[PDB]
Amino acid sequence: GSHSLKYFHTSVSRPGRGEPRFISVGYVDDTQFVRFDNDAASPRMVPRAPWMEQEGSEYWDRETRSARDTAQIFRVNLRTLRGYYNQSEAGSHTLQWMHGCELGPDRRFLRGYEQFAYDGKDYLTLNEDLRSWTAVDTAAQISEQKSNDASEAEHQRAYLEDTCVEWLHKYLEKGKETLLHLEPPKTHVTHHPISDHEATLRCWALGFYPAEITLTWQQDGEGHTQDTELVETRPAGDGTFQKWAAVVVPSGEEQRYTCHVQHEGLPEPVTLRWKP
């Protein structure tokens, strides 16, 4: 079903230290697979997932070139961006760029996006129909009128509806082995006393993929957010993710509290409890 091809590009100017730094990271779903960094020992597009450790030199040279070229474009762009804002080379600035395509359950194009951000704030967005650009500012107007006039939407739309999709499929294929595997979370509940009156119940979800997951506590079979806490999902570092949910309970009421875990890799949602 659902799957996505996404890239995240960052360019950061260093004013008396040469050309700005340029990084590109590629994801298929929640799996990174390539990267380019013009500061790495090898300033080339390089594989970041096992199933790309084979790809011919041709793919790599192509991508190293594409990233390089963009670095240059972005170098010019950082200088232009500084004029729209009335900026000297005094400080360093960031141009961000993201784009991706998403397939619906049928394995076909469902949505594409692309945007630009300057110094962390939205600057230019491709519209939802991929036909034109919107200055998400009024200082980005020149950029909007210039890209709408030169008909630049069209090249991005081709990439996002075709190329990106085509390639999304090659990558799934190259990595079907692991990319389509749904690793369910190893769940368990731990007990951490706070005092004689209360203690913390912590419900653990570990080693799962994809990152999407839902942890909730219930008390006596009712939704329960009072004295609840949920951490952001984090990467285990091995490709999988982690997450935990916490609820403050009175001594001897623990068996009233059940944790529920929803994940795409579980045949059905799991219900947990502290075994004492």
Binding site: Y7, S24, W97, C164
Partner: peptide, 9 residues
């Protein structure tokens, strides 16, 4: 692959 053409702002 990544997008082949990056806008000049």
């Amino acid at each position: 692959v990544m997008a082949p053409r990056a806008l000049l702002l």
